[PDB]
Sequence to fold (996 residues):
Amino acid sequence: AVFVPMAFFGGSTGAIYRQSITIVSAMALSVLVALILTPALCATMLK
Amino acid sequence: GADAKTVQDTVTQVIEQNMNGIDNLMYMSSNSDSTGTVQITLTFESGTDADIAQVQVQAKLQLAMPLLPQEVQQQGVSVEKSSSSFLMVVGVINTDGTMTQEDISDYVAANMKDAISRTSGVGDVQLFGSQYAMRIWMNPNELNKFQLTP
Amino acid sequence: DIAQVQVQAKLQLAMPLLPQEVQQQGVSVEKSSSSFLMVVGVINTDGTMTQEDISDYVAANMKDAISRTSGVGDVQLFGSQYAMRIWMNPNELNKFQLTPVDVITAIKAQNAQVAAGQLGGTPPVKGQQLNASIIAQTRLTSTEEFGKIL
Amino acid sequence: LKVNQDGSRVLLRDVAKIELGGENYDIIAEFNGQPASGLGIKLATGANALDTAAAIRAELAKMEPFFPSGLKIVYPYDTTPFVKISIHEVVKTLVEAIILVFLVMYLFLQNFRATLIPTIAVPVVLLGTFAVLAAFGFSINTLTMFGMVL
Amino acid sequence: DTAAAIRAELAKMEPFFPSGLKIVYPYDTTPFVKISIHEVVKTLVEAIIL
Amino acid sequence: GMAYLFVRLPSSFLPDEDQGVFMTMVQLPAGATQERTQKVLNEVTHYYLTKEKNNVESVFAVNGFGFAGRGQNTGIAFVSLKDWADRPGEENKVEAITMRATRAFSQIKDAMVFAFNLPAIVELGTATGFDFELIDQAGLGHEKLTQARNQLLAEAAKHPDMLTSVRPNGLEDTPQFKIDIDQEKAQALGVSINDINTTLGAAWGGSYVNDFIDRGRVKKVYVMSEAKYRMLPDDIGDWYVRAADGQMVPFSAFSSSRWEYGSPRLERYNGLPSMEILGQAAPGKSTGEAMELMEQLASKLPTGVGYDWTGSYQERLSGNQAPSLYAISLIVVFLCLAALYESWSIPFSVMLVVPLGVIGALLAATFRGLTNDVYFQVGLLTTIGLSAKNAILIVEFAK
Amino acid sequence: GAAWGGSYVNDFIDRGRVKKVYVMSEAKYRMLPDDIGDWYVRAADGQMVP
Fold:
């Protein structure tokens, strides 16, 4: 809600405040990795 | 040969009042030097396909090539994709079997240049020199001597 | 977009087979829409001018920019742009023994731009101090100047 | 050109000098005060930059072997190595940001296997984001690389 | 949209006109669009109210 | 404080970088020659060789080709600096190298040479940056346009306030050698005006005749004249055309010589004559203010003289843009913080951590001389996302 | 052809803008069939021919 709306850019500052989204594929993958897997690993093994 | 005023309204103007009915376009600019040269830039919207627009801008020309001098027709007209800036600038020199700054520009333009512009998406190549040509330097004193003109 | 081309340059293999009268005239390949939308009338109220004077100013200031503007298919002028119009009297032609061929030759001679070179040329003599462009026959301007053609 | 009265032949050499030289002497370049030409390639308005310049050396590579004596290539003004620095110092930056994250995970949790889950987390996320830009059209830009760092 | 910027180009032309040159507007389609919104979006509102 | 440390913090787009590669451009006055400009291109090549061995690997000078346009009045060297490792300090980096290069060329020379690093960018968005363009909308000529642009360059220079730096693109304006061929004189002696126009044209300027084959490849054949028979005005009469009556006739018979004042580069814009105006917003003001205090100067000019911008945003940079972007970033953030929360209080807690992190971002940026460019604008967005974090954790667990 | 129908000869410059030059005849010398004979071509022997 701060990143993708700021990627509603315009003009020669086109791919400038656009390539957020690059950030967010990464954020939603950090959520994915931390919703899959990290839950697993944590249980799988710690102490 | 043409001066600035000549190119201004023999090539430049003719193409400009025949540069219409084109999808997408913010503005148009142009230069017309005293060297007998002209160059128009038709800028388009952001994210416009340079492929389709490279045509469009031309053959919407052409309805105008017959209205130009026969000197300019046989010369190099061109419609290419621009990028105000170079990237690679491959210098070409001689060390051992020495040759001139004229001899080298011919070999560059008669072996490697033709293949470079063709290679992976080059917009336009600028030769730094000139390709050879059968150059003839008419003496006007040995022209009146036998009663003759150019 | 693609079909506007396609239909043409698949033409053109045919422009050389047409008369030279049609080549120099307005050939065109545009996008159609059997119907107008805006029809901006242009008149005079105070400083009165004719239905001929107005069609020139419309076609020499605003029309060139309209067709170019946001995706216009084709503009139809309602009148005509000005032109150096010459009305050959055939009685004052036989009077001096002459034809319309001699009139056309006189305008393609005196009314013509020429590409003269330049002082201190492109390959100069090392040590020249100036380099200026030479002007030659310039294109004619007014109705008086066409009247004084020999 | 002629055959004057007495059987004498006027030739083109008799009236004019004849050497093989450039078609345009308007420009001539030096490379450290040495006589030289060169190819100043300019980009194509959407082309893939470094990929274009990669195969500029593909075409050029096949030219090298058939050169006359002394002809050697040199490389001024070139953009390729700036790309090579923004990867080997971003992907370097990357690695240093992990290595330092690793020791902060050790100082707070002394467990060696606990300072490991987050070390395996972010390398995986990085990679998936490469695959998303590939599917959405983008490239490994100067921008998007800094986007992995932030 | 095309006819919107027909008045964009035309607007910059007006000021540099000789004496008497005035623009007039016959045969024009723009206001038919303006009616099919201010009487559809009007229709809309009346269908709620009722 | 968060405001004051932001309103005063200056605007920008993208930092100009050391690219291991820069260049410097040459330019000569009123109709200089190939010999004159090459003298300056040698002097330039040595500052980079003799007085810059440690920093410069090579030079690639080019005589008679500027980026302003073309002609034997101009020039351009293409520098290729030694790698970054061998260049250690700030002195040995493009900002400092082009600083004392511009100093040396403005000191011991007498033409016009500069030097400049490379806008990564493209060619635009200098920020506090400008490009007006004077258009001739009416039917006046190039002569009356020259004076109108001189009047707008003069008003700018006579009340700046809050200054401005404004110079033309390159109309310089040099003499041209006109030749009036009286046609009643010509056909009297029996010379065709065809013959005369291809005698003056093919001699002085050249004439592309026909193609031949050199060593397998097709090239061109040109025709002109030895250089010495076409250098000055007196060599016009050396050329003799032939008439119908098989006798020679000099050029001086039908020709008259006289100098004029024309332009070596006529520019146009949208099908009408035009002259480019390259200014820069002042060290005080910034762009939106400078441009609008240039528009009322164009309206104080003679009849049949308008204006139009080129091509100078059309929609860019810090906003205009930014605000509307942030605006929605604020209108959403509250939602999401409610799609997993409920109340009318929870989201406000997160929605005033915003300035906590931001003031520190402004401080460090305002501190070491940087600016609100692209990279600071996106370090901001991450900072609100990392405050959102932390804070949300404080809310989530406590609620 | 150039009398009755017109002939696009060559371009000139009116007030800055390039336009066309045309050649034809005053209207009265090309209205009806009898005005064909009013036009006299010239022959190689320097004398007029209707």
About this structure: The two ends of chain E are 34 Å apart (CA to CA).
